mmCIF file of C-alpha atoms in Angstrom:
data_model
loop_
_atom_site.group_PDB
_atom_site.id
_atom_site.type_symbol
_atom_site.label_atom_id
_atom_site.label_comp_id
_atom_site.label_asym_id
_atom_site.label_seq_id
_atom_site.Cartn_x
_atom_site.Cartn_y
_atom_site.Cartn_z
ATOM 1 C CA UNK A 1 0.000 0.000 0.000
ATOM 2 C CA UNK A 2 1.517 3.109 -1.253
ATOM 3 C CA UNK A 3 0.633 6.617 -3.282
ATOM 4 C CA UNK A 4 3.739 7.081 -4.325
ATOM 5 C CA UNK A 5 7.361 5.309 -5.952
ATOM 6 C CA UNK A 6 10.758 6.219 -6.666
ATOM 7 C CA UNK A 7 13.111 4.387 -8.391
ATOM 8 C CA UNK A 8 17.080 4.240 -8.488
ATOM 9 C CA UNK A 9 19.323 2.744 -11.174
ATOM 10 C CA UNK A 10 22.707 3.095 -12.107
ATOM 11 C CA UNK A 11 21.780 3.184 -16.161
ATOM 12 C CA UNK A 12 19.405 0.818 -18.224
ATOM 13 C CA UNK A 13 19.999 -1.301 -21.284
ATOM 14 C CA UNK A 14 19.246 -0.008 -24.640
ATOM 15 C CA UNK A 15 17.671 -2.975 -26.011
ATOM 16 C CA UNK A 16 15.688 -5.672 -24.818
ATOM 17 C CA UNK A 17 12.634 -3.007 -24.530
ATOM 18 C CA UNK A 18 11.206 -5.758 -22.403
ATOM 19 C CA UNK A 19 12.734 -4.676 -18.859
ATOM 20 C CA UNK A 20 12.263 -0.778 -19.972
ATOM 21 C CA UNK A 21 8.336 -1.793 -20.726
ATOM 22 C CA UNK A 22 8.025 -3.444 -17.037
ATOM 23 C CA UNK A 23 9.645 -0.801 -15.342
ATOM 24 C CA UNK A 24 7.536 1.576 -16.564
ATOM 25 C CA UNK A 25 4.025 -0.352 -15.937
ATOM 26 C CA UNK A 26 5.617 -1.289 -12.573
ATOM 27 C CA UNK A 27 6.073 2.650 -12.039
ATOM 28 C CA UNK A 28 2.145 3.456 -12.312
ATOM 29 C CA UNK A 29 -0.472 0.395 -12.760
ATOM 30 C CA UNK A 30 -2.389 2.518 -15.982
ATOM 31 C CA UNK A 31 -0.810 1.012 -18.904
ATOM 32 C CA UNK A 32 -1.712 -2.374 -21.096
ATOM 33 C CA UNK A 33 15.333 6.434 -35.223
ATOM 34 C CA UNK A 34 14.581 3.532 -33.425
ATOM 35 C CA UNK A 35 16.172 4.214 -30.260
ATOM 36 C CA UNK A 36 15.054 8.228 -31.284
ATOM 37 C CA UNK A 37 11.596 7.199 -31.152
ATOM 38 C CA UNK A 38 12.117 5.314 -27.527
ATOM 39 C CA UNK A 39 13.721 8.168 -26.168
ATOM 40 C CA UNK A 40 10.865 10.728 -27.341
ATOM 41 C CA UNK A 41 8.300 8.492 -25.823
ATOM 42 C CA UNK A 42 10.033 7.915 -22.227
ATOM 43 C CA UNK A 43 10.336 11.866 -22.204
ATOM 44 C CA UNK A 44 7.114 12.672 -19.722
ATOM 45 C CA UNK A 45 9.039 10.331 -17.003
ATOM 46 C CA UNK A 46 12.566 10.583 -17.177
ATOM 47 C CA UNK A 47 15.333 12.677 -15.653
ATOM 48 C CA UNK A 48 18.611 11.801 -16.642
ATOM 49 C CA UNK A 49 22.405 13.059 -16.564
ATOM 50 C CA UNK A 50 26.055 12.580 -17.096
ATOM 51 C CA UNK A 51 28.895 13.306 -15.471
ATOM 52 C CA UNK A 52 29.766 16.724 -17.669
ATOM 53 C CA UNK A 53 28.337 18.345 -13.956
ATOM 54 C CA UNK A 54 31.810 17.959 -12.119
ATOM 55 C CA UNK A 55 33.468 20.528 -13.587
ATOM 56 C CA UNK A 56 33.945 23.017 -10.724
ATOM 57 C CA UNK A 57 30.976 21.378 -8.815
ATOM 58 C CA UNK A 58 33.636 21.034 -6.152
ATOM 59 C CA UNK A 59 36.171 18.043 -7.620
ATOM 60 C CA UNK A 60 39.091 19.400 -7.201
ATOM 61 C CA UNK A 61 41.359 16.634 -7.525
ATOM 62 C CA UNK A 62 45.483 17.191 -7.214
ATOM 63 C CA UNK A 63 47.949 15.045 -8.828
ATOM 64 C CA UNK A 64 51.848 16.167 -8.666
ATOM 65 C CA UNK A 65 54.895 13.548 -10.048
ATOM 66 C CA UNK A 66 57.951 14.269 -8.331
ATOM 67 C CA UNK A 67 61.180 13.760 -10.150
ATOM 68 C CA UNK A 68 64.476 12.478 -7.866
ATOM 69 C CA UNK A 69 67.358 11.286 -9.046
ATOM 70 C CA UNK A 70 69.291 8.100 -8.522
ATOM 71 C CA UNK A 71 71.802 7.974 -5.180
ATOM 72 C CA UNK A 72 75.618 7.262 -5.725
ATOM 73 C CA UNK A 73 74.723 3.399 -4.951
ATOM 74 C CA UNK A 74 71.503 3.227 -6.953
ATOM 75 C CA UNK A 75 73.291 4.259 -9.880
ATOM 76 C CA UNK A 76 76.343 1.791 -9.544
ATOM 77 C CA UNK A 77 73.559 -1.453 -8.946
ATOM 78 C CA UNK A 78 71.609 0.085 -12.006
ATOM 79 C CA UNK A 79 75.013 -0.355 -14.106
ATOM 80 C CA UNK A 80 75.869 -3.480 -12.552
ATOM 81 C CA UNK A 81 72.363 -4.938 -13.530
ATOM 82 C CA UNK A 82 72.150 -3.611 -16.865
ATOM 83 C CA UNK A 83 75.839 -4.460 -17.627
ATOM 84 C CA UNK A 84 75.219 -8.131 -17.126
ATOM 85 C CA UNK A 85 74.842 -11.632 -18.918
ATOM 86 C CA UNK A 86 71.585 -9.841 -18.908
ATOM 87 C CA UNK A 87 71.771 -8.087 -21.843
ATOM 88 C CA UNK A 88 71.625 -10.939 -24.347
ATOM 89 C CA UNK A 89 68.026 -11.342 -22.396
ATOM 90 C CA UNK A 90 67.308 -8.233 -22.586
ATOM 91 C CA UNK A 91 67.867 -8.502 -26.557
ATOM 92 C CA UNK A 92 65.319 -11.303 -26.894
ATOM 93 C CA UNK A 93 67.426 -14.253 -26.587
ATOM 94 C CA UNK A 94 65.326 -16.461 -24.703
ATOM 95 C CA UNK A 95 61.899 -16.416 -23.169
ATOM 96 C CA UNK A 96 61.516 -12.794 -23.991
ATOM 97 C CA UNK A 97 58.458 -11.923 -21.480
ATOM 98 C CA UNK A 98 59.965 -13.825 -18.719
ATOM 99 C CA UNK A 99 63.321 -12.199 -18.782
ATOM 100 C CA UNK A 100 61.677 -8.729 -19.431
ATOM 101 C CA UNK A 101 59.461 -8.942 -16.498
ATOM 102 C CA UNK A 102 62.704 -10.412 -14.252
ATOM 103 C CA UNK A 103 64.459 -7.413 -15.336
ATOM 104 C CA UNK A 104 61.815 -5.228 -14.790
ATOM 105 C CA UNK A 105 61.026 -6.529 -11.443
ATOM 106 C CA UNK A 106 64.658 -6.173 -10.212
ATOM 107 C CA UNK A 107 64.924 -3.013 -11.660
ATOM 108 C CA UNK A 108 62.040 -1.863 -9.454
ATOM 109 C CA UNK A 109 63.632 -3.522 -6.174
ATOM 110 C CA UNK A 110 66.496 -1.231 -6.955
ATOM 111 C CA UNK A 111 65.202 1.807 -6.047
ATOM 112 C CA UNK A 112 66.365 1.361 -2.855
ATOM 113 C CA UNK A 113 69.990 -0.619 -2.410
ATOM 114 C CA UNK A 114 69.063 -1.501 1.300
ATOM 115 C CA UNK A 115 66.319 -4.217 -0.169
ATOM 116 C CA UNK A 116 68.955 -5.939 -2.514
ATOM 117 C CA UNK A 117 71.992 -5.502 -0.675
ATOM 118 C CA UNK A 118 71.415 -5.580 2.762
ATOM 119 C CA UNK A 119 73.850 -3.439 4.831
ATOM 120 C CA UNK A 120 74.925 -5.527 7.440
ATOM 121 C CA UNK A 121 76.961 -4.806 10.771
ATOM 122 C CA UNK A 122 81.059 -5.235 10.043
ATOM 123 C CA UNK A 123 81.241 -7.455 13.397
ATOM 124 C CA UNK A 124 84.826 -8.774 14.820
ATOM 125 C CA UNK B 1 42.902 5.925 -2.765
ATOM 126 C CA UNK B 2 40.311 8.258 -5.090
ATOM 127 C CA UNK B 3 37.860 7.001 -2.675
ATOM 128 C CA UNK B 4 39.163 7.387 0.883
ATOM 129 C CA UNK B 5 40.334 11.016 -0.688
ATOM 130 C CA UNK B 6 36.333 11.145 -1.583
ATOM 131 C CA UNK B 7 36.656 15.176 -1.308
ATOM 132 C CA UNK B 8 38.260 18.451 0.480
ATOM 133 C CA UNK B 9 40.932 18.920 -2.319
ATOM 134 C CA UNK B 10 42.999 15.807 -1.888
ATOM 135 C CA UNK B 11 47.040 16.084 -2.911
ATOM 136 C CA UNK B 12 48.357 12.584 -4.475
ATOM 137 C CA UNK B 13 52.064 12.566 -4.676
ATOM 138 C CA UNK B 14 54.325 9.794 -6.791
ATOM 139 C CA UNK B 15 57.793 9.108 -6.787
ATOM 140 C CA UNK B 16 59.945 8.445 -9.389
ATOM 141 C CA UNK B 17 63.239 7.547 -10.066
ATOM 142 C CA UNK B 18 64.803 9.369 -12.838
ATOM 143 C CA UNK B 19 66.530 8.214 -15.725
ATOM 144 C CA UNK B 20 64.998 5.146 -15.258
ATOM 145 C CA UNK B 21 62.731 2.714 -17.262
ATOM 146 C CA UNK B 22 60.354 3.330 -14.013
ATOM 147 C CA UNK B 23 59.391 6.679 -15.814
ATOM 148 C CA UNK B 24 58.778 4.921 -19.195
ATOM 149 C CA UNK B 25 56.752 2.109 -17.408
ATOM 150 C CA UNK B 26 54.937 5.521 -15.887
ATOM 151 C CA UNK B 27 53.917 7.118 -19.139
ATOM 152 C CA UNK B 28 53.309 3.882 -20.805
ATOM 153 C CA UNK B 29 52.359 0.419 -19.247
ATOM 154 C CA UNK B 30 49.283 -0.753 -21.002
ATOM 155 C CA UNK B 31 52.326 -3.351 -22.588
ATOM 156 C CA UNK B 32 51.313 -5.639 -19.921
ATOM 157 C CA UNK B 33 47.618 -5.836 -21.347
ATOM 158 C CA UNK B 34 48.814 -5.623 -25.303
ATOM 159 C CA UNK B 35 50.507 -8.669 -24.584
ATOM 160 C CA UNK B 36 47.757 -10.848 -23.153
ATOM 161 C CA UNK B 37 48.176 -13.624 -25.753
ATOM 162 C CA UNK B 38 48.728 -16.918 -24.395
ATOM 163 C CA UNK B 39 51.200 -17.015 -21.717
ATOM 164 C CA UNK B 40 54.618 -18.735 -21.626
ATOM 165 C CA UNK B 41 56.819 -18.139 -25.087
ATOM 166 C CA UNK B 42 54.548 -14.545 -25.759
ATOM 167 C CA UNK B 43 57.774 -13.265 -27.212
ATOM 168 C CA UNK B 44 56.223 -10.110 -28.262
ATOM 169 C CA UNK B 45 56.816 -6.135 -27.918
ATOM 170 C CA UNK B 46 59.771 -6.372 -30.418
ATOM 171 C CA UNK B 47 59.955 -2.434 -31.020
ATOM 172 C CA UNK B 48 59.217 -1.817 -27.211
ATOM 173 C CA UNK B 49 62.312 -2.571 -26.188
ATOM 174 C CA UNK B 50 63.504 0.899 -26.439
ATOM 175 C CA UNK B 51 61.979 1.665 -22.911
ATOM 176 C CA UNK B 52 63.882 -0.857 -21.416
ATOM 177 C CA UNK B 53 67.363 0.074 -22.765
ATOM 178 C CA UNK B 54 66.647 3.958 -21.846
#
């Protein structure tokens, strides 16, 4: 028992005119160029509306990339890695994704020496 | 991250190594998905390789 409905959904199909016709009998119990002519007829019920609204409707979103450079020990593990047996893999010798993503992988480690070499204490 | 930062003018900072292939992996790394084709021997992204060796 009810005088009144809303609805909420996220966006409807554009064929299968099936669920579009139930919805809209569901919505009021009073009813028994192609998608141009759908549209026109759902206009007395409808309220639609994209997403052009964020501009300056308070979305103020902040991205900043940051260059740095390498340190004195990056660089010399970067040369070491790069001048290695490597390179042949890194020229498609063998198993070209598997060696890429290796490299890659090791590459990304190396932003930081103290994960690949560990510095240790120089106990007695 | 977009969603915890839902709103009051969030700041998203990234860190990258320079002169690096990190950068070119930045600016382009849809080569993962270009290379979905069936795994093990893919032996693709022939002209590609220029990120790597810069």
């Amino acid at each position: 028992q009810s005088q009144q409905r809303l609805l909420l959904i996220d966006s409807p199909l554009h064929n299968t005119f099936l669920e579009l016709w139930t919805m809209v009998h569901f919505l009021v119990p009073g009813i028994s160029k192609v998608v141009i002519r759908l549209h026109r007829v759902t206009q007395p019920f409808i309220l639609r509306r994209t997403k052009r609204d964020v501009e300056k409707q308070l979305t103020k979103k902040y991205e900043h990339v940051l260059k740095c450079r390498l340190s004195n020990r990056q660089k010399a593990l970067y040369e070491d890695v790069i001048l290695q047996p490597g390179t042949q893999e890194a020229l498609k010798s063998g198993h070209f994704v598997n060696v890429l993503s290796i490299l890659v992988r090791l590459q990304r480690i190396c932003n930081h020496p103290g994960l690949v070499e560990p510095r240790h204490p120089g106990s007695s | 991250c977009d969603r915890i930062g839902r709103c009051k003018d969030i700041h998203i900072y990234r860190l990258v190594s320079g002169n690096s292939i990190e950068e070119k992996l930045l600016k382009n790394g849809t080569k993962d998905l270009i290379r979905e084709v069936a795994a093990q021997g893919n032996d693709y992204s022939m002209a590609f390789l220029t990120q790597r060796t810069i």
